[PDB]
Design a protein around this nucleic acid. Structure first.
Lengths: 194, 511, 539
RNA sequence: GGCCUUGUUUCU
RNA sequence: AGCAAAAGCAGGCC
C-alpha cells in the first residue's frame, strides 16, 4: 500500500478528522511511503475529477452481456427429473474467432505500430480491426496490460466439459445455472443481439 | 551403459538377460497359461459372499450398557443448555465489547465485588487460590478506563494458563546414555457409559425461546420464478428457526471464535480478556447486550498449525452443580452470588474451566455459520423428495397444505416407548441442532464413526427396500464401527439412538 | 420427553441425506514388504541393498492381500487385450512417435510440488531446469541450446555413466554412486529427473486408454486395498515392452527406462519420532536417517515391533529401498490400463458365467451374467482368484454385492468479489448445489466480506474508524444506490446477475462526479473477470 | 532479564 | 496442569 512519488502524494491529505492517511518514511523494495485504506475511500469522496472516455470504450462485451440480461425473457419453472450430456461447449459467446498465437501477435502489433513487424496476411486481413480500435483507444491512457487483457478476453475461445441439456448456444451456456439444476428446468430466452 | 546393466537387473524371476527377457517377451505362446493356474490355485483362496438377514444386526457396541463405567462427561468448550447472561438495554449502536462488559456488569453491581467465594466441585488438579485472585484482578481490569483488554504479570495465570510447562530441546548425542529417554504411549481412551443428560440437551436446544440473534445481509431484488421460490423457502426456514435457542448458541460461538483468533493475532503475549458477547434483539425491536463470560489467553507465539494456547473460560451459570456430578469433573465451581431475576431464586456460580485450542479449531470456528448451509440443503433434499411425490412447488403443502399433500407428521421423539409427532418446524430445528452438535464436540472419532456407519446406513436402507444385499464381512464392518466408539458424548448417544432405532425397525418390520 | 435425531429415517429415505450419511511411511513400507516376504529375493550389486521381488513367486494360501503375480499371465492378458485392439499398440506407438519429436523442455513449470536433486526437499519446479543447466552444462550436457527434450534425455541417460561430477550447490564434487542415488530417492514426492519420462509413459497410457470402453446378474461395487502398496514395476516394464514390440529400436531403447528407475526406487524415511524423559525434562529428535543407530530397546512396543520386521531391508545410509510399490499414485492411468486389462479376460475355464463389468479408476463395478445363483458364486470366486493372479487385491470390507438394480480470498477488493462470485457460480453449475444454498451463500459471503474490510452500510449502527467516512459519503451523495460494497451501499446480486463485475453493473445509476473521482486515470496507488480502477490494488 | 513487526481487532 | 489418537505443544532469539 505504497504510493507513486510526487504530486501524487499531495492530492490526498495527510490527516483527515483525526484519521491517518499516509506515512513519512521510505521503503526498500520500491522505495516509497505507505498509505491507508481511508485514503482509498477519501479519493472516492473528495478527490479530483477524472474523465469518462475509453472506460466506456474498452469494455463493451460485458455491457453486451448486461443488455442481454436486461432484454431477456423468462418462462415456466419446470419440475421432475432431467437427463444431461457431458459435452464440451463454448462457454461465453465470443466476439470474433481467431487463433490465439497470431491473435497475441496482432494485438502486439496494435500496441507497438513501429515494432509491429512485417505485414503478414493475417495482419493484412486484420488491419481494419487494428485501425477501427486504434481510433477508439485515442481518448485515454489506459495501461497496455489492461488493454491486452481485455483484448485477449474478447478474442479467445473457452472450451470445457460440463453436463448440459436443452440448448447449445453459448448464451445458454452462460445462463445454464438459471436454466436447470438436477430436478428442475426454467424456460428462458435471452434478449437483444446475440 | 550402466543403465543397460540395471535394465538387465530388473529382470523378473525366471530369466537371465534382458535380451533373453525380450526374446522371451515376443516369442512365447499365448494359450495354456491361466486355466492351469486355476487348477493350480488353492481351494481356500476365495471370497464366498453371504446373504444379509435381520438377525445378525446386533446392538452396536453393547459395552456401553455395563454399569461399571464412568459417566459421559461434558467436555466441550462452552455452555449450551445452561446459558445465563444479564438483562440489558441499549439502542443498537454496536459498541466496543470492552464497553459492553463495562456496561452490563456495571448494571448488575450486586456481583461487583462478591469477594466471598464458596468452593463447590473442585477437581483433581484445579486449585482455589489462583483462580479466585485471577478472576478478581481480571474483573478489576474491566471496570476502568486505563486501556482496553490486557492483564498484569502475576503468578495466578502463570499457574492456571501455564508458563514454562514445556521441556528444553537439547542435542541428541547426549540423549543416548541416559536410559530415561523413552518413547511415549498413545492416549488411552477410557471407555464410558451411555448418556442420560445429552438427551435433555437435545430436548433443550430445540425449544422456542423469546430471543433471536441472527442477522443476514440483504440481497438484490428478484423477478425470476426460481428466485421467487428460492427466497420463499429461505424466508420460511429462517422464520422457522429464528426463535430457537441454538441460534443464540451459534452466535455466541461465532463471535467468540472470531474475537479469539483476531485478538490472538493482534496480541501475542499481552494476556487479553475477551467478553463473550452476543447482541440479541427482542420481538419488538429493543436490543439486548448480553454479556455472559470472560476469557484469558496466555502467550501465543504460534509457529505452525498445532500450537496451542490455554483458554480459561469463566461463565456465569444458573442450574446447580449438584444433580449429575459426573458431568462436571473439570468444573471448578466458585460461588459468588444469587439473583432474583424475575420471580424466584437463581444462583451465581462461575465455572472456571481450563481449556485450550489450536489454530485449526479457531479458523474452523470462525466458519461455524456454515451449518446453516448443510441444514438448508438437507431440507432441500427432503422437499425435493416430497415434490417428487407430488409434482410441483410443494413446500406450500408443508406450511399450510396444498391440494393433495397434507402437512405430514414427522416422528421425532418417543414417550414410554410410543412415538410422538413433532411439527415440521420442530424437525427442522432438530436437523439444525444436529448439524450444530456435530460441530460443537466434533473431533476425529466422529468423522471415523460417521464415515464407517454410512455403509451400514446404506445397507439398512437397501434392506428396507427389499433389495437383499450380500456382504462379505459383517464382522469387518462392525469392527470398523466399534473400534472408535469410546469417549465423545455425541458418538455414544448416537449409538444408543441407533440401537433403539434398530429395535423399532425390528419390531415394525414384521411384515 | 425422550428424543432421537435418527427418527428422521422413519419417513425420509437415507439416500437423500447424503450430506450427513514418519509412522505412516514405515507402516506403508511394512505393508508393502510384508505381502511378499516369502517371494523371490535377488540382491543387487550397484547398491547391494536387499531388494525383494514379487514377480513369479508361489501362490498364496489365504485371503489376505499379497503382491504375488506370474509374468506370462499378465503378458497374455495384454496380448488378448491387443487382440481386441487391432493396431492400437501400433496407434499408440505412432502417436508417441509423432509426439516425441516435438518434445521440448517446456513442460517443467507446472510443478507446484516437485522434487529437485540438490536442496533435498520440495520445490515448485521453479529453479528445477535452471539447476539442471547450471549443474549439467559445465559437465558438457547440451540440450537447452536446441531446447528439445530429446537431447536432454539422451545426455541425461548418458549422465549416470560419468564417474565424477562437479557442480555448485558453494561448489561440490562427488563420485558416481551418490550422483545416481541422490537422483533416485523420493521423499509422496516424484523426480524431476524422471518426470518427463513418466510423462511420456503417461501420455502413452492416455493414447492407449482414451479411446477405450434367464441369466441371473448379481453385481458388486468396491475399491481395492493397498492399491499403491501392492503393485510392482516389473509388470510395468513387461507391459511397455509388449506395447513397443512393433516399434522401432530407439523406442524400445527409450520406453524401457521408466520402470527401470521405478525398479530401484529408494524411499526416504519421513521426519522421525521422539522420546521422553518425564523427570529430567530434556528432549531430542531422532531424524530420518539414523533410526536403528540407537538403543533399540529404548523405544516403545510399537516402534520396536515395527523395526523388528523392517530391519532386513534397511540401507545403512538412512533410506530404505522398496522394489515393489507405487506411493499414492503417479502411474494412475497406466495402472488403470493394467486394471482394465485385468477386467478384459471375461472368462476362465468356460463355465456357465460371463462378465460385462465396466472400467473405472482403482474402484470398479462388475456385471456377472451366470446361470443360477451358485454359478454367480463360483464366478465371483474365480474372478477374485484371477484378479489375485495379477498382484491385485479386492477389498472385501468396503463392498456390497447385491441383486441387480474457504471463505473470502483476500488479495484486493474488486477481484476478491469476482473470485468469490465465480467460485459460487461454478459450484452451482457442476454438482447441482440447490439454489437456496447458493442464495444464502451469497449472504454469508457478503457478511464475510463486510467483516473482512469493515465496509458496512452507512445507514447502519456499526462504528469504526473506517465506517465514519462511508457515513460521510452517504450523507454527501445523491447517488441513492450507485456505490460498490467496499464503499458502503447495498449489494444487488441474486441468482442471475453473476457473470458481471461490480462497476460494469453499477455504472448506469452511478453519480457523475463520484465516478469521475473513482475512474481517475492518475490514480496514484494502483501501480473470472475484472475491471481496472482504484480498488484494484495490491500490497 | 530485553525484542518478536505501535495500536484499537467497534458483525443489523 | 489442559488439548489432541502422523509424536507434539504448553516459546524463540539474545
Amino acid at each position: 500500500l505504497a504510493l507513486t512519488k510526487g504530486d501524487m502524494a499531495n492530492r490526498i491529505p495527510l490527516e483527515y478528522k483525526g484519521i491517518q492517511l499516509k506515512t513519512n518514511a521510505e521503503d526498500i523494495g520500491t522505495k516509497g511511503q505507505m498509505c491507508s485504506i481511508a485514503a482509498v475511500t477519501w479519493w472516492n469522496t473528495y478527490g479530483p475529477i477524472g474523465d469518462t472516455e475509453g472506460f466506456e470504450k474498452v469494455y463493451e462485451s460485458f455491457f453486451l452481456r448486461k443488455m442481454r440480461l436486461d432484454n431477456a425473457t423468462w418462462g415456466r419453472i419446470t419440475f421432475g427429473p432431467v437427463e444431461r450430456v457431458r459435452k464440451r461447449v463454448l462457454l461465453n459467446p465470443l466476439t470474433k474467432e481467431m487463433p490465439p498465437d497470431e491473435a497475441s501477435n496482432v494485438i502486439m502489433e496494435i500496441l507497438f505500430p513501429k515494432e509491429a513487424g512485417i505485414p503478414r496476411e493475417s495482419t493484412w486481413i486484420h488491419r481494419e480491426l487494428i485501425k477501427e480500435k486504434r481510433e477508439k483507444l485515442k481518448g485515454t491512457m489506459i495501461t497496455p496490460i489492461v488493454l491486452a487483457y481485455m483484448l485477449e478476453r474478447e478474442l479467445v475461445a473457452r472450451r470445457r466439459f460440463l453436463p448440459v441439456a436443452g440448448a447449445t448456444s453459448a448464451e445458454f451456456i452462460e445462463m445454464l445455472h438459471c436454466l436447470q439444476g438436477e430436478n428442475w428446468r426454467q424456460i428462458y430466452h435471452p434478449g437483444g443481439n446475440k | 551403459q550402466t543403465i543397460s546393466r540395471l535394465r538387465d537387473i530388473s529382470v523378473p524371476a525366471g530369466f537371465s538377460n534382458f535380451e533373453g527377457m525380450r526374446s522371451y517377451i515376443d516369442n512365447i505362446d499365448p494359450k495354456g497359461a491361466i486355466e492351469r493356474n486355476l487348477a493350480r490355485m488353492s481351494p481356500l483362496v476365495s471370497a464366498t459372499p453371504k446373504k444379509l438377514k435381520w438377525e445378525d444386526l446386533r446392538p452396536i457396541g453393547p459395552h456401553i450398557y455395563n454399569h461399571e463405567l464412568p459417566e459421559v462427561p461434558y467436555n466441550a468448550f462452552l455452555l449450551m443448555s445452561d446459558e445465563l447472561g444479564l438483562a440489558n438495554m441499549t439502542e443498537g449502536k454496536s459498541k466496543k465489547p470492552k464497553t459492553l462488559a463495562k456496561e452490563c456488569l456495571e448494571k448488575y453491581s450486586t456481583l461487583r465485588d462478591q469477594t466471598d467465594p464458596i468452593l463447590i466441585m473442585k477437581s483433581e488438579k484445579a486449585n482455589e487460590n489462583f483462580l479466585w485472585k485471577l478472576w478478581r484482578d481480571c474483573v478489576n481490569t474491566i471496570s476502568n478506563e486505563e486501556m482496553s483488554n490486557e492483564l498484569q504479570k502475576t503468578n495466578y495465570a502463570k499457574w492456571a494458563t501455564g508458563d514454562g510447562l514445556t521441556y528444553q530441546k537439547i542435542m541428541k548425542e547426549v540423549a543416548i546414555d541416559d536410559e530415561t529417554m523413552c518413547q511415549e504411549e498413545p492416549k488411552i481412551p477410557n471407555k464410558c457409559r451411555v448418556a442420560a443428560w445429552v438427551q435433555t440437551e437435545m430436548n433443550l436446544l430445540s425449544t422456542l425461546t423469546s430471543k433471536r440473534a441472527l442477522d443476514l445481509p440483504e440481497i438484490g431484488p428478484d423477478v425470476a420464478p426460481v428466485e421467487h421460490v428460492g427466497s420463499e423457502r429461505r424466508k420460511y426456514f429462517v422464520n422457522e428457526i429464528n426463535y430457537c435457542k441454538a441460534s443464540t448458541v451459534m452466535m455466541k460461538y461465532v463471535l467468540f471464535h472470531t474475537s479469539l483468533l483476531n485478538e490472538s493475532n493482534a496480541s501475542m503475549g499481552k494476556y487479553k480478556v475477551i467478553p463473550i458477547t452476543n447482541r440479541v434483539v427482542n420481538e419488538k425491536g429493543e436490543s439486548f447486550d448480553m454479556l455472559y463470560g470472560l476469557a484469558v489467553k496466555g502467550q501465543s507465539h504460534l509457529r505452525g498449525d498445532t500450537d496451542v494456547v490455554t483458554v480459561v473460560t469463566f461463565e456465569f451459570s444458573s442450574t446447580d452443580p449438584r444433580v449429575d456430578s459426573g458431568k462436571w469433573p473439570k468444573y471448578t465451581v466458585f460461588r459468588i452470588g444469587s439473583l432474583f431475576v424475575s420471580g424466584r431464586e437463581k444462583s451465581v456460580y462461575l465455572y472456571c474451566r481450563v481449556n485450550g485450542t489450536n489454530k485449526i479449531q479457531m479458523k474452523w470456528g470462525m466458519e461455524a455459520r456454515r451449518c446453516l448451509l448443510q441444514s438448508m440443503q438437507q431440507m432441500e433434499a427432503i422437499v425435493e423428495q416430497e415434490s417428487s411425490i407430488q409434482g410441483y412447488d410443494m413446500t406450500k403443502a408443508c406450511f399450510k397444505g396444498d391440494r393433495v399433500n397434507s402437512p405430514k407428521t414427522f416422528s421425532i421423539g418417543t414417550q414410554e416407548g410410543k412415538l410422538v409427532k413433532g411439527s415440521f418446524g420442530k424437525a427442522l430445528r432438530v436437523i439444525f441442532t444436529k448439524c450444530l452438535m456435530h460441530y460443537v464436540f466434533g473431533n476425529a472419532q466422529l468423522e471415523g464413526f460417521s464415515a464407517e456407519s454410512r455403509r451400514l446406513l446404506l445397507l439398512i436402507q437397501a434392506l428396507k427396500d427389499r433389495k437383499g444385499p450380500w456382504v462379505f464381512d459383517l464382522e469387518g464392518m462392525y469392527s470398523g464401527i466399534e473400534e472408535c466408539i469410546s469417549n465423545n458424548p455425541w458418538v455414544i448417544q448416537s449409538a444408543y439412538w441407533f440401537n433403539e432405532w434398530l429395535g423399532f425397525e425390528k419390531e415394525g418390520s414384521k411384515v | 420427553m425422550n428424543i432421537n435425531p435418527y427418527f428422521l429415517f422413519i419417513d425420509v429415505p437415507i439416500q437423500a441425506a447424503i450430506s450427513t450419511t514418519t509412522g505412516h511411511t514405515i507402516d506403508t513400507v511394512i505393508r508393502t514388504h510384508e505381502y511378499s516376504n516369502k517371494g523371490k529375493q535377488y540382491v543387487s550389486d550397484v547398491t547391494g541393498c536387499t531388494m525383494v521381488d514379487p514377480t513369479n513367486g508361489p501362490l498364496p494360501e489365504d485371503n489376505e492381500p499379497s503382491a504375488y503375480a506370474q509374468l506370462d499371465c499378465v503378458l497374455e492378458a495384454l496380448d488378448r487385450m491387443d487382440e481386441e485392439h487391432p493396431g492400437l499398440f501400433q496407434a499408440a506407438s505412432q502417436n508417441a512417435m509423432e509426439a516425441l519429436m516435438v518434445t521440448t523442455v517446456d513442460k517443467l513449470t507446472q510443478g507446484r510440488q516437485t522434487f529437485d536433486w540438490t536442496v533435498c526437499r520440495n520445490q515448485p519446479a521453479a529453479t528445477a531446469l535452471n539447476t539442471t543447466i547450471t549443474s549439467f552444462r559445465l559437465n558438457d550436457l547440451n540440450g537447452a541450446d536446441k531446447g528439445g527434450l530429446v537431447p536432454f534425455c539422451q545426455d541425461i541417460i548418458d549422465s549416470l555413466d560419468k564417474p565424477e561430477m562437479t557442480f555448485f550447490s558453494v561448489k561440490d564434487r562427488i563420485t558416481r554412486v551418490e550422483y545416481i542415488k541422490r537422483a533416485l530417492s523420493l521423499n509422496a514426492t516424484a523426480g524431476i529427473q524422471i518426470r518427463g519420462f513418466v510423462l511420456v509413459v503417461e501420455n502413452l497410457a492416455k493414447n492407449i486408454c482414451e479411446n477405450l470402453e434367464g441369466g441371473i446378474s448379481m453385481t458388486v461395487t468396491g475399491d481395492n486395498t493397498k492399491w499403491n502398496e501392492c503393485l510392482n514395476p516389473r509388470i510395468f516394464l513387461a507391459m511397455t515392452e509388449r506395447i513397443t514390440r512393433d516399434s522401432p529400436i530407439w523406442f524400445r531403447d527409450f520406453c524401457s527406462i521408466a520402470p527401470v528407475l521405478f525398479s530401484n526406487k529408494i524411499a526416504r524415511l519421513g521426519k522421525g519420532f521422539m522420546i521422553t524423559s518425564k523427570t529430567k525434562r530434556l528432549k531430542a529428535q531422532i531424524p530420518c536417517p539414523d533410526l536403528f543407530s540407537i538403543p533399540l530397546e529404548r523405544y516403545n512396543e510399537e516402534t520396536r515391533a515395527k523395526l523388528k520386521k523392517l530391519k532386513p531391508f534397511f540401507n545403512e545410509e538412512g533410506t530404505a529401498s522398496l522394489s515393489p510399490g507405487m506411493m499414492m499414485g503417479m502411474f494412475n492411468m497406466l495402472s488403470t490400463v493394467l486394471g482394465v486389462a485385468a477386467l478384459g479376460i471375461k472368462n476362465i475355464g468356460n463355465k456357465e458365467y460371463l462378465w460385462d463389468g465396466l472400467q473405472s479408476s482403482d474402484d470398479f463395478a462388475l456385471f456377472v451374467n451366470a446361470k443360477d445363483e451358485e454359478t454367480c458364486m463360483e464366478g465371483i470366486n474365480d474372478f477374485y482368484r484371477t484378479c489375485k493372479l495379477l498382484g491385485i487385491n479386492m477389498s472385501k470390507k468396503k463392498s456390497y454385492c447385491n441383486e441387480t438394480g474457504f471463505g473470502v480470498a483476500g488479495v484486493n477488493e474488486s477481484a476478491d468479489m469476482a473470485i468469490g462470485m465465480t467460485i459460487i457460480k461454478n459450484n452451482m453449475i457442476n454438482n447441482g448445489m440447490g439454489p437456496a444454498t447458493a442464495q444464502t451463500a451469497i449472504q454469508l459471503f457478503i457478511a464475510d466480506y463486510r467483516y473482512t474490510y469493515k465496509c458496512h452500510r452507512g445507514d447502519s449502527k456499526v462504528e469504526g474508524k473506517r465506517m465514519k467516512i462511508i457515513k460521510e459519503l452517504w450523507e454527501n451523495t445523491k447517488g441513492r444506490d450507485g456505490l460498490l460494497v467496499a464503499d458502503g451501499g447495498p449489494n444487488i446480486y441474486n441468482l442471475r446477475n453473476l457473470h458481471i463485475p461490480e462497476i460494469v453493473l453499477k455504472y448506469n445509476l452511478m453519480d457523475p462526479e463520484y465516478k469521475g473521482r473513482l475512474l481517475h486515470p492518475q490514480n496514484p496507488f494502483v501501480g473470472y473477470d475484472a475491471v481496472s480502477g482504484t480498488h484494484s490494488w495490491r500490497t
